[PDB]
Each structure stands twice: as C-alpha cells, then as structure tokens.
C-alpha cells in the first residue's frame, strides 16, 4: 500500500528552473488528491480534459509531476494552446493536454534581497518546443550569419537569462512555483488509482 509521493513535489525546498524543469514519474501507488483541492495561496488550479472531483474515481497508467519556477506574468502560458517565451522555448503543454496545472506565489521562498539569480529561463531558440520537450542546451545562439563558435558577443548571445527575483518586485514579476500533473492513459493497465 504505497502512497504516491506528492509531498516530495509540492513541499520540495528547492525547485528547478523552467528551462530545465524536473519531472517525477509517479506510478504503482495510492493517490490522495484531497490534499490539494483547497490550499492556502493556490493562485492557479486549472484542470484540462479531466475534472478534479472525478480523479479519485479514475485509475491512470502513469502520472507525471512537472515542477519549475516562473514569474507571475508567465503562469498564463502554462496551459494548452499558449504562446510566449515560456511556452515556446521552455515548457510546452500539448493541445490535448489531460491534467491540472497548479501555481502559487512563492515570493517568501525564492526571492532574495539583491536578486535570486539562481532561477533561469531560455530567451533564444531557433524553433519552438514540442510538447513536454526539455532543452538544457547552453550553446551560443546564432542570431546573425557569421558563425559563433562559442564566442559571446554581437549576434552571438548566451541563450539563458536570469530572473533576479527580488522581494520588492511586483506580483507579476514575483516567483511562482508551478506543478503540472499529467494523467496518462495509453496502451497500458492502470496503476495510479485514487482512494
């Protein structure tokens, strides 16, 4: 009677950057979705393709827990059929996404006076990300016709950029921890049931 490790994902002391988002494969366990429904600062609990009140009555093959950090003005992009720097170049959700997205203001955790430059995001990319694609490449982005050859400068820029979360920032620029739960039911027997 193993319980699904949801505490390790939400109550994690440190989250990953959006460009290198972490994913926890959850399977063969008893899931308790009652711990999530009504939290304290849960700024977002939008579900797509499935209802929350029916998750306790559904069994799934694999449940993927994606966690990362973005700013408040970018949480609207963590949704099916969205465009922007986060959606196209960091974390993309498919159009037929089945699952829920959870976000909450973590200004009291991920913002330091002076700037928390530890969280990063991808600014430049030649093409858009496929759904659930993770690109951790740090190659010098070529914005011109002259080859870069790993030399930062003009028309050759580092593809990653810092957030610099300061506690005095506005709500939209404050850090938000996002947890995206994907519910998969493919060619498979279901093992992540509810109780």
């Amino acid at each position, epitope marked *: 009677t193993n319980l699904c490790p949801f505490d390790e994902v939400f109550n994690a002391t440190r989250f990953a950057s959006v460009y290198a988002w972490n994913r926890k494969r959850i399977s063969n366990c008893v899931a308790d979705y009652s711990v999530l429904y009504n939290f304290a600062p849960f700024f977002a609990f939008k579900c797509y393709g499935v209802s929350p009140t029916k998750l306790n009555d559904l069994c799934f093959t694999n449940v993927y827990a994606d966690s990362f950090v973005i700013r408040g*003005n*970018e949480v609207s992009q963590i949704a099916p059929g969205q*465009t*922007g*720097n986060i959606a*196209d*170049y960091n974390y993309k959700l498919p159009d037929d996404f089945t699952g829920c997205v959870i976000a909450w203001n973590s200004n009291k955790l991920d913002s330091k006076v002076g700037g928390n430059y530890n969280y990063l995001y991808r*600014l*430049f*990319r*030649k*093409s*858009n990300l496929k759904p659930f694609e993770r690109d951790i490449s740090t190659e010098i*982005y*070529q*914005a*011109g*016709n002259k080859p870069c050859n790993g030399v930062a400068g*003009f*028309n050759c*820029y580092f593809p990653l*950029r810092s957030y*610099g979360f*300061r506690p*005095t*920032y*506005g709500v*939209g*620029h404050q850090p938000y921890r996002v947890v995206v739960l994907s519910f998969e039911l493919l060619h498979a027997p279901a093992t992540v049931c509810g109780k």
Partner: antibody
Amino acid sequence: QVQLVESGGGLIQPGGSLRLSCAASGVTVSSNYMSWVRQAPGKGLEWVSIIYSGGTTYYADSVKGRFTISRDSSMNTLYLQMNSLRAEDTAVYYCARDLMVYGIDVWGQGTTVTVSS
Amino acid sequence: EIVMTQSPSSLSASVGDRVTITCRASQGISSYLAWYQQKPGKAPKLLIYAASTLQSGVPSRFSGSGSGTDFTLTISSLQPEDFATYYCQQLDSYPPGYTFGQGTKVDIKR
C-alpha cells in the same frame, strides 16, 4: 554590413492595402525577434507587431485584424501587410531587431506611409 | 496596459551640464527598461538596456539607474552631439504593447 532597409511605403487612400518590406543583411530575420515600430508626425514611437524566431506573432490592439507580420527566410526579409488602412496609420515605419532584455539595437532607416482621401 | 510617464517634456542645457531625465511606469517592471536617443529625420539609437546597462559603443557619460517604477537617464557631461530627444521603453513581454515614454527634447540653453 549590418543594416535593415525598408521599402514599400507611399501614399494610399483609407481602406486600401499596403505591403512593407525590410531587407536585412548581417542579421538573420528568422533567427531574431523582429518588430515593426511606427512614429506619426510629431508623436512618439509606437510598437506595431513582432514575430518570434519560433513563429509566434503579436500585434498592437490598434492594428489587430488589419496588420499581419510575416517573413521569407530565403529572402532574409521582414514584411508587414497593412490592410484596411486608416488616416491615423500615417507614420514612418521602422523594422528593427529586438533583443528583448538587451534592447532594440538594429533599426532601419524607415519608410513613409501616408493614408489620406 | 502600462503607462510610461516621462518628465520633463523638454529641458534646456548647456554643454557640460549634468542632465537627468525621469521615466515612471504605471506598474512595476523591475529592470525591463531601455533608453533611446533620436535626432530629427534619423532612426532611434539604443543607449541603455536592462535599465542600467550601457550599450556597446555608447559614450560612458550616459548612465541609467533605477528599478521597479522610477528610472533615470543621466548625461554626466553634456556634449554638442547629445542635443536630441530621448525615450524610455518598457521592453517587457507582459502586458504586450512595449510602450515608449512621451519623450524629452534637450535643446540648447541660451
């Protein structure tokens, strides 16, 4: 030679259509954030449209449904299709290379559009 | 929409003066701000990006400062080729727009 060269502007009646071109050399259009900025006589700069290197486009409210930004990678050229033009669209139109947090470093010389009856 | 209030609309300065132009955002935009210079009949010229970082090639007498809502462009020692019109820009993704300031004309004081 890093430059942006605009063309296609001119005089046109209200309701008509006009296509602006932005020939780039040095900067690869399909690899950058490319924006159109216009400036009416005596007024400030007004952002019009942007196209991400990945294909995402964005438009100002005053030009939504009327302007459509595009590009031809083989030509290394940025375009701005202006339909249902109005008098307030009279401005010098600049195409520019946007570096998001690093600013807008490369500007074109601008092409003039005049919409009047 | 974010409203960029820039003041003063115009200011008069002699060569060697310390000029200060102020840009105020309607909401917080952290360091997402840039400063531009434009002369009549020419394209804008990027001076400062990220509120306080000097663009390559721009003389060191230019400097930007501030974060959040209040920003200032500073010309420590005005030179003859600095009489122009200066704009601030909210170079931030949300909320769309990318708005510019009303602009500040710096004419010759006599």
